[PDB]
Design a protein around this ligand. Structure first.
Ligand SMILES: CC(C)(COP(=O)(O)OP(=O)(O)OC[C@H]1O[C@@H](n2cnc3c(N)ncnc32)[C@H](O)[C@@H]1OP(=O)(O)O)[C@@H](O)C(=O)NCCC(=O)NCCSC(=O)c1ccc2ccccc2c1O
Ligand SMILES: CC(C)(COP(=O)(O)OP(=O)(O)OC[C@H]1O[C@@H](n2cnc3c(N)ncnc32)[C@H](O)[C@@H]1OP(=O)(O)O)[C@@H](O)C(=O)NCCC(=O)NCCSC(=O)c1ccc2ccccc2c1O
Ligand SMILES: CC(C)(COP(=O)(O)OP(=O)(O)OC[C@H]1O[C@@H](n2cnc3c(N)ncnc32)[C@H](O)[C@@H]1OP(=O)(O)O)[C@@H](O)C(=O)NCCC(=O)NCCSC(=O)c1ccc2ccccc2c1O
Ligand SMILES: CC(C)(COP(=O)(O)OP(=O)(O)OC[C@H]1O[C@@H](n2cnc3c(N)ncnc32)[C@H](O)[C@@H]1OP(=O)(O)O)[C@@H](O)C(=O)NCCC(=O)NCCSC(=O)c1ccc2ccccc2c1O
Ligand SMILES: CC(C)(COP(=O)(O)OP(=O)(O)OC[C@H]1O[C@@H](n2cnc3c(N)ncnc32)[C@H](O)[C@@H]1OP(=O)(O)O)[C@@H](O)C(=O)NCCC(=O)NCCSC(=O)c1ccc2ccccc2c1O
Ligand SMILES: [Cl-]
Ligand SMILES: [Cl-]
Ligand SMILES: [Cl-]
Ligand SMILES: [Cl-]
Ligand SMILES: [Cl-]
Ligand SMILES: [Cl-]
Ligand SMILES: [Cl-]
Ligand SMILES: [Cl-]
Lengths: 285, 285, 268, 282, 285, 284
């Protein structure tokens, strides 16, 4: 197989700001098809409050619908933290995190599903702490590129929380059941080499090379078939998500079927008020 | 167990219009907590175009976030059709249904997921045809109340489409594998009695009684525990949706854990920069 | 719009393709139906290893004949569809072959469908039963069991209470009982059995063969884990190959150049 | 099975010594019967009741003369009304005499599930709430014409989102399961039969007579085949826990073969095993 | 996150004997909440006979119901073996291991289920051989701490047995399918480093420090929320055990619901013979 | 307790069974190993529909030969194991074209055949295992890799994908993070990289590839064939839902037939009596 030149992979990146209207995040797009979502609350180690999550959902929705975007990067502002999870300062007694109107949210669950069902690869670019809900977020991303200063772990049993959804089951599909139980039960911190050794991240690079390397990985994907990528992502989800995974995988099959003459004949016949004739389309074995 | 007040179930219903801004649907709310989404394209048997689906998504999102709403009804305008599925007149060659900007969508998949993950019961109120994607929509709703004039079925293999996601697997969890294969492979139409006999709808009533009966069922649910309902809906999805189902079910467990003193101690300790003391909370077996 | 009943109930012209077979008949109609008939009425159409080998061969032929769109499985005579394994484990291979067949398979049942013969009708996508049809398992009565698709898939048809009843007691069930529990798709008078079955086949023969195979795979996928994903994804690959985007990948490789996927717009 | 055998008289030997909340009885032809005996509270279970039911079911499992177990309630008015609400504490469960909070019916559910002998629910009158989940968990349900079924969770501030939800759906389908749980209606015996929730409905006066007939039909059959099929049917629901049961039965069968035994013998005789004598099947 | 002091983690441990009545095992409890079950048949490399398993089941049940116990350690007596599986000297022809009365048991399957469903973490403390059924036992434990002399492997295909239950499927969820097939098909032995590298154990420590390090890990968990731990254990089981896993996870959710005012209102209304009133409890989104 | 190394590393005697095959070689050892070798080195051992048909035929023979206990799959030469579907014959109409113009995806049949084979199948990989050829080594129960082996997928680059066992089952081997990397980027991985991620069972010098593979086969050949087939089914059952249950339960039925209780139906028939199951003591 022929491969892309490293010179192109390491070409300069031109980012354009698309952050207007956002208070808690930055949102940027490169000319060559990368969207970057940056949590921008470094004073609280990039913890998310409900507003933060709402903005991330809005940005990811925009990235999904922009046909010039092929890959999304999720990251945190600064070098100290990717994300430290839900903002404990606004965590209420009544079953969620409080917004300024007093409504209690667990809206990161919506963002998790949105990352999961996104037909474009999402890459976590991790510098410093990826902890708690912030650790589940990196796990949800298809790939994780980690700096050598990255630190990983959960804190639920120490802070009176837990993610028993994708935070548990999907973690096990990454690091295996023994390591998943250790990570959750003891709530230790793991350095970048430890994370790499257990298969929790895809690669570790020096912090100075983090963005350069991440952009390289994104560009490798951008050279590939977007249709193939979305089908494979759905197929990999389908090993985990039961009928919800089937919904994604089968939905892509329908999309492909619509592009065939056989599928189109069914539509055409209905619009033309006649019976379809599928006899011209030979049956494969 | 004491029973609901029968006279109360049949009290008059006061609807308020919330349709401002919508072109393809109506959206209404009752004073006692029912939201009603009505597809309003009877000239095409209430077939949905991408705009229709976008509007339904917006209304369901509003219903989810309105804490005064406890149950949602999905229905079609007029008595002739609930929904005839995707609008074939705008179905493009390029893998989806075309909006006025020429973008190709399969956004009913998003709407399916939104119904699935909605923590409030969604009730399909079916008069006349529920066909194709419109049949999958009634199936996705938690309950279906059918008029005696209701007609059910798929048309995919006749019209050059298929829903191999929840439209297939989840149908089988309702009517069984033999009936599911019949429904999909032959694309016949089934009357209301046939649908009831196979467990495809919850009840059949005369058309004249359809809204009255639907409102009664909604009111029975509205007097019950909203927390129990959302946990049970998640638990029933979890028999189908693998890790995506675990995400919903465990997420509700987290919400409940946040309401306990043990959970709150973890938050409090973190905010107060001290170690938590969980020893006061006795271990159940 | 639906096909005319005059067409659905038109006469059927069968051609024999049974050369070489000792235990079965194999026939094909002009309009795309293949029919496999277990032909051992003297033993209530029980299968022996040769029978199973022949059925596999016939079904393999039907799969590869692009003129065939639907397969009927049935027994010779009016007394039995199949009474299972011969009294005096390759049927598992035959079960798998029915499951993975990209064409609909219809069980046409007159009289007894019992034991391994009962699991066979269940494996078929649809079952059309005559009013004299009788259904049930016998394993626990004779010291056997089918704990594979014979158990789990049975439960996906009739539900868990009835599956346990059917297996634990080994009663016989008449056609009405089977219909009521969702075990068969329809019941018709014995004299009309083939006539109605052919109608059902012809209704499917009017529909998209690609859609049918995708849906069959999708329904299998609710049951068969990664093996089901293999079928469903495999059809997706087949479709992808028919697209310009897929073909560009092939063309680029053969032309020893990098592919350019940029003309193929990203759908949301 | 002819009628003389299926409808032979029904006689019981009492084995209830030591129990406060249940009766436990055995027949000569291989049936054990566990009867919840708290009719004054519609046969609601308190933690002691569940502990006793577990003890009785364990006894039935280990008694090689027993092939089938019947679960039922005393009197004609109730099978079981679920957890005893009078002793339900604030701290996450039902309180015993020590003040410990239990949800021990979950242990009893798992024990019915993994029991290698068929368990049959014999239902007269109310099977409601946790009592309804109990009939669903039994392999078969025989209902009297006076039987009434339903859940009450969303009305009583509880839910069974385990086998009470998912397994119900495998019986009545997802539409009916959501109706049963969300509305908390009661369903009569005819309604239950029509939706497939029970296996048969019989006149109340004939309830035990018919239940015992069903038991006797199973008792004529292979106990090993039954336990393998029960495991196989659980395996369609219970993932690896189901695989544990099904494969466990395969191990038991393998131990009974000469091939399996050669391995043991070789180890005990401190030599290499020789499996060459045993032909490889396709 | 603040972590416990190492001085506390490595403080001496004081054990109290609770072995009265046991013939094949020891059972001990520490003042700070650890229960330890020790197989005591070193003359047969700590192989279990049916009595051994019955005793282990009794001890584990005691640990589950003792509200002062938060973590359980499973181990073997001496330094040479953790457990060598079923006692082949008492394995009968008739489908199981014989007790002194001649009844044939496979009761370790009950013990596997009991470890699985135990709401407290169970830790395998492994010195020397963990082989056959004894290897499955370490795998079933939530975590495994191994001494540098530990040896791991299966022997089924060599001794005429197999564990195709959790011994196969769950092994694959720990070490992956390639290694699971290697381990089972060839029946080799693996040293502690090999086991660590494939993710089969959580850590490897010097033999002299085995209990010291194990007690440290236990104490780290004892500082954490017992409710969070049991929910996460159930959640991780749920990725494997289908509806049986849902029973555990949902059961914990019910327990939490019982602790809420909303749940309690339902109980109260029933006990007071009145309609429940759930209107005071706001619906979260 | 364990076998002798002298026996494990003894010479191997192969006899040819390739008569009739155009695209593969097929050989059997005296001690119970069958070896299927793809023989199209000029296309890096890429398979066309005929190649797959022949491999299916050979594997069926090995399955049915009771003298065979283990099967090796490998490629001819040292440069390639298999490079996947032959792109030179890949048609527009949904598959790879044979000489008659029929479009096939018959490697899917071969995948299922390897999966359901009751004997262990071992991938012996020298050089490239790429694309459909990479899925094939993954499907094999074990993979022994030479130090020159190269692994990877190319789907998104060549306009294809295997979203069946090629995706889900890969994830059960290397985990979800690495599976997504392997598929999304289509890089190549060397033998060390593959070993480190758990994609292969061992890496050995190329000169020793067959010697070590035969040793692994011989270690399995000394073990119980029944236990091995039950375990293979049990391990498939963690992945394949009801299809996996079919295999596992089918083995249970076979075992049951070997017991007196299982035989009671046959015996009753021959003795002209009704079966009596009351006589068999119930285990708990
Ligand atoms: C390991 C650190 C990330 C960094 O340590 P470091 O020593 O560098 O800094 P530190 O001094 O702790 O923190 C700096 C400042 O940031 C703040 N901060 C850090 N993390 C958070 C945070 N998560 N929330 C609020 N404030 C935070 C600190 O309070 C402090 O600010 P200050 O009070 O001085 O003004 C540490 O800050 C830490 O342990 N943070 C807490 C992590 C944590 O427990 N997160 C919540 C876990 S649970 C969760 O995320 C979550 C969310 C949504 C869920 C939805 C459904 C189901 C489950 C969910 C869930 O589990
Ligand atoms: C429909 C009945 C069964 C019968 O109606 P009926 O009108 O004939 O009789 P009733 O007058 O209500 O009852 C007669 C007496 O029995 C008592 N009783 C009936 N059921 C219960 C009961 N369940 N608990 C305590 N007392 C009960 C009544 O209080 C009353 O006693 P009294 O005041 O005269 O002294 C009715 O009594 C009734 O609705 N009972 C309550 C049903 C109920 O809500 N059960 C609890 C559901 S939740 C549950 O069971 C459960 C248990 C364990 C779980 C574990 C893990 C996860 C979930 C769990 C779970 O959801
Ligand atoms: C059985 C009816 C519902 C009613 O018959 P009736 O005789 O009463 O009325 P009819 O005369 O046919 O229709 C009245 C008018 O409505 C129009 N109409 C009805 N349904 C549709 C429709 N679905 N699309 C466009 N026009 C429709 C007719 O064209 C006609 O309008 P006109 O031509 O006079 O201007 C019939 O109209 C009918 O078969 N309609 C087509 C149903 C159909 O095939 N729908 C699409 C199935 S597939 C689909 O929905 C779908 C959508 C999204 C998906 C996303 C992911 C994966 C799969 C998806 C999917 O499969
Ligand atoms: C590698 C060793 C663990 C240690 O080697 P070492 O060289 O240090 O010691 P060794 O000389 O072999 O043994 C010392 C003494 O202990 C005895 N011993 C060791 N293991 C066992 C043992 N498992 N049973 C009985 N005796 C044993 C030896 O016989 C010997 O006793 P002695 O002759 O002096 O009186 C070796 O002893 C050994 O391979 N033992 C056998 C391991 C084995 O095959 N276990 C059974 C596997 S299958 C299993 O466990 C099992 C159980 C329940 C199941 C239930 C359901 C489904 C499956 C199940 C299952 O697969
Ligand atoms: C990395 C190599 C294996 C070796 O590189 P190398 O540099 O050593 O050699 P190269 O010069 O590229 O190749 C040598 C010769 O072999 C040929 N060749 C190698 N592989 C293939 C090949 N796969 N098809 C056709 N020709 C091939 C080359 O064209 C060339 O021949 P020539 O033109 O000079 O006559 C490279 O040749 C390569 O990338 N080959 C293509 C691999 C490839 O994309 N395979 C198809 C992936 S998709 C697939 O396998 C597949 C199959 C069935 C499926 C069924 C259901 C669902 C999915 C399926 C599926 O995805
Ligand atoms: Cl920055
Ligand atoms: Cl956390
Ligand atoms: Cl009109
Ligand atoms: Cl449709
Ligand atoms: Cl069903
Ligand atoms: Cl309830
Ligand atoms: Cl073993
Ligand atoms: Cl590929």
């Amino acid at each position: 197989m022929i491969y892309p030149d490293e010179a192109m992979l390491y070409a300069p990146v031109e980012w354009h700001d698309c952050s207007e209207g956002f208070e808690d995040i930055r949102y940027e797009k490169s000319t060559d098809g990368i969207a970057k979502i940056t949590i921008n609350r470094p004073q609280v180690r990039n913890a998310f409050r409900p507003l933060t999550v709402k903005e991330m959902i809005q940005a990811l929705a925009d990235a999904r619908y922009d046909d010039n975007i092929g890959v999304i990067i999720l990251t945190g502002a600064g070098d100290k933290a990717f994300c430290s999870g839900g903002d404990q300062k606004v965590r209420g007694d009544y079953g969620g995190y409080k917004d300024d109107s007093g409504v209690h949210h667990l809206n990161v669950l919506d963002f998790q599903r949105q990352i999961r069902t996104c037909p474009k690869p999402v890459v976590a670019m991790v510098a410093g702490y990826s902890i708690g809900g912030g650790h589940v977020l990196h796990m949800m991303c298809d790939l994780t590129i980690a700096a050598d200063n990255a630190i990983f772990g959960q804190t639920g049993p120490k802070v009176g929380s837990f993610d028993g959804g994708w935070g548990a089951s999907y973690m096990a599909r990454i690091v295996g059941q023994k390591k998943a139980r250790e990570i959750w039960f003891l709530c230790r911190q793991y350095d970048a080499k430890q994370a790499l050794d257990m298969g929790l991240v895809n690669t570790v690079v020096p912090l100075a090379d983090l963005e350069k390397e991440t952009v390289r990985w994104c560009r490798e994907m951008l050279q590939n078939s977007p249709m193939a990528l979305r089908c494979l992502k759905a197929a990999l989800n389908a090993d985990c998500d039961g009928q919800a995974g089937l919904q994604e995988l089968a939905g892509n099959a329908t999309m492909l079927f619509y592009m065939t003459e056989e599928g189109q004949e069914g539509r055409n016949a209905f619009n033309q008020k006649r019976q379809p004739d599928f006899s011209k389309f030979k049956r494969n074995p």
